[PDB]
Each structure stands twice: as structure tokens, then as C-alpha cells.
Amino acid sequence: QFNPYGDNGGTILGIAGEDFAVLAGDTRNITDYSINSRYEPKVFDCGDNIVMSANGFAADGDALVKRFKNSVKWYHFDHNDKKLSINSAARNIQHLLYGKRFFPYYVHTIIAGLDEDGKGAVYSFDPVGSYEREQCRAGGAAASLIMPFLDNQVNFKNQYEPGTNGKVKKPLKYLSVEEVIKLVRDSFTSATERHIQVGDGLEILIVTKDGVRKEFYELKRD
């Protein structure tokens, strides 16, 4: 009996700062312990400074993107080139996954971008359909592996000020762009060791008002 839905591993990570947002991911593509493809990108530009990866079952994600590209074309044509909103894209994506609800799509999707305010913003989709605005959200099977680090290095959750021992919580502190890229590298480097999904390359597309920057780093192959 044919396999209803594949898995192609991978881990992605969308982080909402206050002036940038990154969408990170490995390039390692797998089925079982064989590397299907050592290099194969997954973060895709959708335009107007909105990035997208539909991580998990690769085939479902290719379909999802493929249709969304077409919709971007008809959104601009009828609305006199209104800049396709982040939220508008999100509602659109929800509606593709809810499209077959009976045999739901098997993709854990993250779109990142800027909201209209201008803060970095991340929206995250669970496959069941639902979506919500999020601060930091990793996706995939190692979503749970990565998240505690971020909730103890930036969110400062469960950190308190030295010497109070809990009276006064240690307040949020905004980080530069650079500072976040290092953090993203270290998380992924640790996961190369501790998980076989992450490796080959760490390709990060960063979306600002200033345009799109591309950042690349190699990860090991062991």
C-alpha cells in the first residue's frame, strides 16, 4: 500500500525581532539515514519581503508554494498593485491547508516578514490549519529541541535579576541583527551533533525594509 505522506526531515526557524526577521533552515534533505540531497534550498522568497518554507513533507510544500506564486500574481493585478500584506498571505495559506481537511496536508509552515507597523513578525501554521502571530517559533521534529535556548537567551523567561532571586524579572532586551545570526548558527551547529536532520549548510534569507540579504555558513557532514 502506497505511503500516504512522506517526511523529508529538516528544521526551520522564524524569529521576529523589532526590525528584521530571519527564516533559517538547513539544506540537508533526507529519507531515513540516507542523505537524499546534501544541498537543496528550502527558504523561498515570495516577494514583497515575505519568506516562506513549508517544512516536513517536501512534496506537499512544493505544491503549496506553487499555487501561492500564482496567487501573488492575481492579487496585484486586481488591486492596482497593493502591497501584498503579511497577514493577507497568512489567511491565504490557512485556506490552502483547510482545502483538504479530510486528508489534511502534512506540512508545518512558517512565513516571516515584517508587519505593516514595521516590526519583524512571524506567523506560524500548524497543519491542522490554525495560525497565530508568534515571537519565536521553530518548526519540525527538532522544533522542541531548539526552542528552550531561545527562551533563555532572548526571551529571558525564567530569568530574574542577579541577587533578587526572583523578585524582579530580567526585562526584554532588543538585539541587533548580528547578535541573532550568531545565535541561529550555534543552535543549528549543536543540533548537527544531536540530530541527523540538521547539517550540510545553513542558509538564511533575512528580510528587511532595506531589501533582502542572503547569509550562508557550512555545517558538517558527519
Binding site: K66, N70, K73, W74, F77
Partner: protein, 233 residues
């Protein structure tokens, strides 16, 4: 010959010329003037944006169809619409399925056919609107004319609608000059302005009315107005 034969598409005159066809052509003559031309590397359409009165905004008659495609209308407004959305559809199918941008020529053969179906049919409308379509494929720049007949013809330069006489003459003369000119967006765009002045009874030369489109091997399909067309005006 009102009613009787030639009164409906099916019925033939003895000779077999539909009188209606000539009327559909007349709709183009009543239509907004537009001049199209090319060079190997660029295709430039100039169209006068008609308006009702001062307060009514100068209305675009150049429509971007796709990133690398666009068209201009002269003739009946409802017909142009049903056809334009179809242009868009076909281009999307090929890009998705077969990878490729829809070639300009090959899209035209389909467009011909669509016009002939309404001529076979009891009832329906043969499309009564003529379209100058420009495009950038892997064969480079093209310019077609779509007729109410259906026929698509690759022409160096042509003009349709109101007082075509002055710009057609102008194109014949400067034929050799704009076809040699390549690698110069700005000069093609100049040739085209100069051309539309001849057709007009000097109705307007305003930046506000002329709208210029260009798609080629260099520029994507971009609509130019106000200041960008003030360079060349």
C-alpha cells in the same frame, strides 16, 4: 443590409462576406489611437489615455497583463475584458506545468481560435476589439496585432484607431532607423512619442495623457507616466 442574410453570423451573403465583420473594424476606428513599434531588443506602445471631462481622471487603456506581457485596447470595452483575463490564464498554465513563459506567437494561435469559435456558433459574440500585444520571450521582443477576424501578424510597426494616417506614414519613413537602434531604451521610446504626434490633430501632447509601456530584453513590462515620460516629451 439590416436583418435577413448577413444578419447573423451563420447566414451567408451569396458572395460569403459578413457585413458585421467590417462593422467590428469600425469599432476600432471609433477607438482610441495607439502606435506600436519595435526593435529587435524592445517593444514600445504609446497610447492616449482618453477622458470624458476635466474632473474625470485620464483613464489607462494600457493594461499590464503579466510581468513580461501587456496589451492595449482599441474598440469595444466589454470584449477586451473577457479576452484579457484569458491571456493571463494561459500564460500561468505554461509557467506552472511546462516551466516556460508562454511564448508570444503561440499564445496568439490560441487567441485566433477563440475568435473563430464564436463565428462557428449560433449566437455569441465574435470579439469586436483589436489588441496590440507586446512581449519578451526566449525569441526576444515581439509585437502582434490581433484582429476582430482573429488573425495575428508579426509586424515591425503598426497603429490602430483614430486618424492612423499620420503615424503610419511616419513609421514607414523611420522604419529603418528604429530597427537598427538597439541597446537604447530611451531612443525607441522617443521614436514612439514622435510617431503619435502625427496621428493626433494636436489634441494633447501633455505628460498627463500619454502613457508609454515598454517590455523587451532589457526593461520588464513597466508602465511609464508623468515624469518618466516627461523626459521624452
Amino acid at each position: 443590409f439590416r436583418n435577413n442574410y448577413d444578419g447573423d453570423t451563420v447566414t451567408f451573403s451569396p458572395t460569403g462576406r459578413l457585413f458585421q465583420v467590417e462593422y467590428a473594424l469600425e469599432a476600432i476606428k471609433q477607438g482610441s489611437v495607439t502606435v506600436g513599434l519595435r526593435s529587435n531588443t524592445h517593444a514600445v506602445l504609446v497610447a492616449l489615455k482618453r477622458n470624458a471631462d476635466e474632473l474625470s481622471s485620464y483613464q489607462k487603456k494600457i493594461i499590464k497583463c503579466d510581468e513580461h506581457m501587456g496589451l492595449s485596447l482599441a474598440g469595444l470595452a466589454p470584449d477586451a475584458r473577457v479576452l484579457s483575463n484569458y491571456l493571463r490564464q494561459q500564460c500561468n498554465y505554461s509557467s506552472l506545468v511546462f516551466n516556460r513563459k508562454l511564448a508570444v506567437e503561440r499564445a496568439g494561435h490560441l487567441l485566433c481560435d477563440k475568435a473563430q469559435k464564436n463565428t462557428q456558433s449560433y449566437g455569441g459574440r465574435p470579439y469586436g476589439v483589436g489588441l496590440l500585444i507586446i512581449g519578451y520571450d526566449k525569441s526576444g521582443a515581439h509585437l502582434l496585432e490581433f484582429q476582430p477576424s482573429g488573425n495575428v501578424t508579426e509586424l515591425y510597426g503598426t497603429a490602430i484607431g483614430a486618424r492612423s494616417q499620420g503615424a503610419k506614414t511616419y513609421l514607414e519613413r523611420t522604419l529603418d532607423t528604429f530597427i537598427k537602434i538597439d541597446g537604447n531604451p530611451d531612443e525607441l521610446i522617443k521614436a514612439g512619442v514622435e510617431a503619435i504626434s502625427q496621428s493626433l490633430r494636436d489634441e494633447s501632447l501633455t505628460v498627463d495623457n500619454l502613457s508609454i509601456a515598454i517590455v523587451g530584453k532589457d526593461t520588464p513590462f513597466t508602465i511609464y507616466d508623468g515624469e518618466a515620460v516627461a523626459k521624452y516629451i
